[PDB]
């Protein structure tokens, strides 16, 4: 009815700009302040100036807020096309403000770009062509089509860049973590939105008669259930574009799920178990112990140090070592819980010497690997 | 012959076999279900389309199995069981291998696009987050004069995630390309024809510096082979490797080509510290851009020290208002009115003069070398317009116009060759010799370990501007088999000696009179990862602590010492009464602030100074080498060794070289300033009466205890003096 009134805007906006680039390229090919502007815009979107850091944060907030408005429309709406006068609805009113901001930001970006032709084909340029022009067609008619609007979820893929431009991701595993999570979520959310468009619209060569009224949340669930290869089939696709999208989705996203889930488990499995710091009681003595710490050296040490024939004294033993303790050593450290403690660290580090309060120890004992190959190296 | 590449051959085999097997399997299932079971008279049948079978087989291949569609005939079900046994393996091996192939494309291909008037510099060699972050932090530093130069990194690797972050933060002025300077197509992509320079960075922490220098020499050979006229600035790890690139047909120092040899520079700074006890810190701080930034927990000495670290050396043109002044008037004027320390001038072909006397006039457009906090300070000397406009007395307002035998070049003392056994001594011979005010080198080497080039240490100590009676005797304590292969370079220097054995033996140390020396140098040739970074300096640390503990009852922790660290974070072990913190960088630590420690990491920012002002790098090299000219580097590159003999008065004229000395406010004519005078009063007085140019102080840390002193570079005019201070001076006599 008017879905194409919007597909027009989106698609046509893209074509006229592309043509204007091609004729400009050809005219200049057959036949300074520009570079000052290009560099200023580049410094701005890269978060290098203070105004750049502000704008870049506004992109972070308004990309999320633009997605939340899409969830509100995807949730509380019935037909894919919908008649509702623009002057009536506060959500579509505030969405115009975001679409204006993303239109300004699109031109900023364009100014900054090195090759204008390639810029007109960047993913975020397509997100902008499919989002903003239809949001203006929805003013010229008092109706709206919830067409390619799901592509707003792709704006989340800017987040790892914002959190780089703002220098807040400093560590390579934390950089890798945020890239994994944000790309996986935005690809899932955008795929769910595309399936929702296909099933609720139905097959065009069957006059849109073949259609199935899933909610967005049922598509989001259904895609997680097929990503993971569970496939309950409580929900399934029935249109032929729905089914062909599921075949393409199965070929792509099984690999993403099967590589995402392991790598998140490797990253979250990386935190140190025996961090933290020794807490000195009001009158207990302690001894710090370090060097060659293992189940053998520790069991032989404690069997003599804590032996029943010694005069009874409350001395705690504080092991400090770089390793994670082995399972049999964790058992031994648990059996002696009240008087033996273990910390990950090294006597080579002044922060670790502070954690074990070595200022306040009676002694430090430094144990040797007697069975090493090179006793000059051990010494 | 259209599939030429093995990955593209493998790609088309995977895709075409997978698709045709899927399409044919779908067709076979369609035949079975639509025909039905023959032993049930074809009554058991299910009218799937081909497209439903094609979908259904993808849904079971992937093991999803929705069961919206499923097989019901018994031949359909038996075909599904056979299909499950075969095709789960195909899908599970196809999907990974396509992801490996499509994951193989290069991310940083493409080519540099040259803007209408921006300059650029190509950078290559050892590119990593550490080397790039340290390079950019100095190259793009806020205290430099603002210039639009782009940096174009060229390297074979994919950048690591932390480096991709750094390249994104600098997006507008830093670019990265996958490639190598060894490939003529990659040299074209970065438009190296049109670069100002190529910078070739070195992995200083490699195991084999001869192998690293071989790789860097091949890169300069590649860049010069592509186009001879490119300015190449290269970092070298070994001094003997400089001879190889001096011999390339198109290497030309007069055009800008340069080799930052870190072994030469390292041993040069510590050698000048044996003559002026803190110079290596004084001087190594002038060649890294840093800005003074207080924090309220810093002690007085740390605030004084850190204000000095904010200084760098800058080049600027003196204004026309300086014309026909002598260098002494121009220096008094810069210091007293402009608050700038001028220390040299480029005299018109042209030649550098350091602290020239009253005979030298400022000519029009004379370039001068200044110590100052920022390039914005030194501009004042270009804008200074006399009585015409620059009349007023607060410096911020100046901003608008007047609207015995020597070497054959006479630079070093010289000796005819000798066998090492002429200079070898046992402990009894060494102890019988009355060594006093000497230099002790405690070398730590294995016989096979790489040559460190001790010539670069000894040669500054034999500079011809010293009289023969005032040359410090030098004794090397170390491995003899190593010193035999070192000796060929050393054999031309007078007053040298060798005590073979370990420097950790507390007898060698006593025989050498270690308590009477003017400087003990602790140096190591051992492998830079013989083990993990905690063991890397254990011999140097033990040697320091050993000397610091001895007792010389006829003491101990007052023997002067300078140690060269293979790993900067080991500086924390080097001293006690210290308050160590691993997050402080080397230049802020007490051992470096006292001139007791040195490490090659402080020399990194010489690369960028060679780009921005090559003359400043020749200024420091003439100071730290004691006068090694390019003619001497040419003569050494002939491989004859250092030729010398008696010299003519016309070459012997160069024995009046300016040198950095150190003097005490305790006694003699300057002592009047020690009793509560100010540094500006001292500066002007000494410049006028003696032509001495004062560049800093060496002051006791404990103003009351220990003998530790710290260096203050270029104090304020009003800075209070103590009678125990020592002053660094540029001087002719
Ligand atoms: Ca500075
Ligand atoms: K499965
Ligand atoms: K399944
Ligand atoms: K299933
Ligand atoms: K099922
Ligand atoms: Mg306890
Ligand atoms: Mg550019």
Numbering used by the authors:
A (entry chain B): 14 to 44, 79 to 426
B (entry chain C): 214 to 561, 567 to 621, 706 to 856, 882 to 1031, 1037 to 1065
Can you provide the manuscript's text about this entry?
The large-conductance calcium- and voltage-activated K+ channel (BK) plays a fundamental role in establishing negative feedback loops to control the firing patterns of neurons, transmitter release, insulin secretion, and smooth muscle contraction. BK channels comprise four identical α subunits (Slo1)2,3 with seven transmembrane segments (TMD) and a large C-terminal cytosolic domain (CTD). A voltage sensing domain (VSD, segments S0–S4) and a pore-gate domain (segments S5–S6) reside in the membrane.
When compared with the WT Ca2+-bound structure, R1Q displays the same conformation in the TM region (segments S1–S6, Cα RMSD < 1 Å). R38 in S0 establishes a salt bridge with D162 (2.8 Å) in the S2–S3 loop, and the carbonyl group of N161 forms a hydrogen bond with K85 (2.8 Å) at the S0’ segment. These interactions are consistent not only in R1Q (both apo- and in Ca2+-bound) but also in the WT Ca2+-bound state. In the R1Q (apo and Ca2+-bound), R2Q (apo and Ca2+-bound), and R3Q Ca2+-bound structures the S6 gate adopts an open conformation.
